[PDB]
């Protein structure tokens, strides 16, 4: 059994969830984060097997500079509806192929090779709608009081990471435990 204050903490000010009625699981990440890249083989298959009442979401940590730029790329891909399909390839480009993907022109030229419309990528990247999603994501990370990645937050209420949980497998087992806690809770 896990212990509040040890493997996870409870946020004294819970944060609203992106999809009311589902148990939210957020992974805060940065595409350029090696620990984030390394966790992917653990969290990806798990995330695809979650039940119908769970909503898994990735949230880019907008902690400045290149993190903001890569987060803006993430959010642009989500808007275009293609992030899932090019997700692994972005991680691979950054960590294996030496691609910096540090400007929208560079991102668009890379993503074109993965099927992504460059004009639509560029227009979405610079859109007002993306500005709002950026601020939303910033304010969420501030409200979760997250100061590094990868970090998990369940149902806007419980924050934990690989170190606190005690390893990558433990991170998912803890998430499972916390999902069950929320499923059992009175509505």
| Nearest-angstrom CA–CA distance, 187 and 184 | 9
Three-state secondary-structure class, residue 108: helix
Which domains, ranges and CATH numbers included, belong to the chain?
Answer: 1-187 (3.40.30.10)
Of the chain, the end-to-end C-alpha distance in Å amounts to: 24
Q: Report the alpha-carbon angle 163-141-102, nearest 5.
A: 90
Structural biology method used: X-ray
Kindly list the distances between the CA atom of residue 67 and the CA atoms of 72, 81, 124, 143, in Å, as whole numbers in the listed order: 8, 21, 18, 18
> Measured on CA atoms in the order 81, 77, 75, 36, is the torsion positive or negative?
positive
Measured between alpha carbons, how far is 30 from 66 in angstroms, rounded to an integer?
Answer: 9
Tokens in use for 116?
Answer: 């992504």
Q: Which of 33, 27, 28 is nearest to 175 (CA)?
A: 27
């Amino acid at each position: 059994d896990y212990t509040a204050g040890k493997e996870y903490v409870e946020l004294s000010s819970p944060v609203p969830v992106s999809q009311p009625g589902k148990i939210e699981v957020v992974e805060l990440f940065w595409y350029g984060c090696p620990h984030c890249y390394a966790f992917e083989p653990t969290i990806v298959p798990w995330s695809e097997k979650l039940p119908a009442d769970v909503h898994f979401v990735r949230l880019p940590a907008l902690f400045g500079g290149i993190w903001n730029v890569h987060g803006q790329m993430f959010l642009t891909l989500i808007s275009m509806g293609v992030e899932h399909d090019v997700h692994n390839a972005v991680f691979e480009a950054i960590h294996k192929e030496h691609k910096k993907l540090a400007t929208p022109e560079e991102m668009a030229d890379f993503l074109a090779g993965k099927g992504v419309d460059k004009e639509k990528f560029l227009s979405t990247y610079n859109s007002f709608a993306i500005k709002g999603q950026m601020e939303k994501a910033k304010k969420l990370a501030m409200a979760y009081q997250v100061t590094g990645v990868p970090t998990m937050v369940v149902n806007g209420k419980y924050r934990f990471d690989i170190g606190s949980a005690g390893g990558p497998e433990e991170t998912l087992k803890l998430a499972d435990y916390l999902i069950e806690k929320e499923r059992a809770a009175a509505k």
